[PDB]
Design a binder for this molecule. Structure first.
Ligand code: NA
Length: 261
């Protein structure tokens, strides 16, 4: 009996995504030969751009260029793992493909010195939103965050992130208009309870609190792969292997890869 593993490729076939979206290939088993996996994945872009592979964990590899994508780029991915030994006799269960395109450049910068989140679309300021980020004891990390999933309404529960709800930094919070920007649990979301503090004082556990209307706007206009950059906070840097932290790894290190470690 064969040992098989199924690949899953993102983003979605035909999706339009932002300039920060990486190609993601996740397998349902640990990959013992990361080099075989990389060799089996073919990527074509138009206009052509150099890119490289980097593993976030034993099951998931990412591919991106050095710089954010050029708007209008079309990308084809073929994960040709059928017939490929991905290490220790674990074979690809199937081949998978995605074709996607890059939309407008959307980069929203949150500067702790001004407490404003400024959304720029192809270089042009379209919104200036007062924000309240993580208070000093639970700060928002600096760095480049890739926009992920969005929810009209959800609960953020700190136990998802290893912090008990009953503990001083714990929370179990209903939020409207929530756009996820890290797997570590940073979201841009509606925070009617911090509208006074927004633009002046950090009060959150690390999320970018903005007004109800600004969060709904963000929910409506920003898409997976668009960019939030956080600067000047008292936090550290979002980890490169967060899940949405890919761009915080310097290109030389990204390009060198981690196929053999
Ligand atoms: Na305010």
């Amino acid at each position: 009996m064969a040992h098989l593993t199924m690949p899953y490729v993102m983003p979605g076939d035909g999706e339009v995504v932002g300039v920060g979206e990486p190609v993601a290939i996740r397998f349902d088993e640990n990959i013992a030969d990361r080099g075989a996996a990389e060799k089996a994945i073919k990527i074509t872009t138009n206009p052509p751009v150099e890119g490289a592979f980097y593993w976030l964990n034993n099951r998931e590899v990412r591919w991106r260029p050095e710089h954010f994508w050029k708007p209008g780029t079309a990308v084809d991915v073929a994960v040709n793992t059928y017939g490929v030994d991905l290490g220790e006799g674990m074979f690809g269960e199937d081949n998978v493909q995605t074709h996607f395109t890059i939309g407008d450049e959307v980069i929203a910068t949150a500067d702790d010195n001004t407490k404003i989140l400024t959304v720029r679309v192809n270089g042009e300021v379209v919104k200036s939103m007062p924000t309240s980020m993580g208070k000093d004891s639970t700060p928002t990390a600096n760095g480049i965050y890739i926009v992920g999933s969005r929810y009209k309404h959800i609960i953020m529960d700190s136990s998802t992130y290893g912090v008990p709800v009953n503990s001083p930094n714990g929370y179990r919070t209903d939020v409207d208009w929530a756009t996820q920007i890290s797997y570590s649990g940073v979201f841009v979301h509606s925070a009617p309870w911090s509208v006074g503090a927004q633009g002046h004082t950090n009060t959150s556990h690390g999320c970018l609190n903005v007004s109800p209307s600004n969060a709904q706007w963000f929910y409506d206009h920003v898409k997976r792969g668009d960019i939030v950059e956080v600067v000047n906070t008292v936090g550290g840097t979002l980890p490169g292997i967060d899940g949405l932290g890919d761009w915080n790894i310097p290109w030389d290190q990204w390009r060198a890869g981690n196929a053999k470690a």
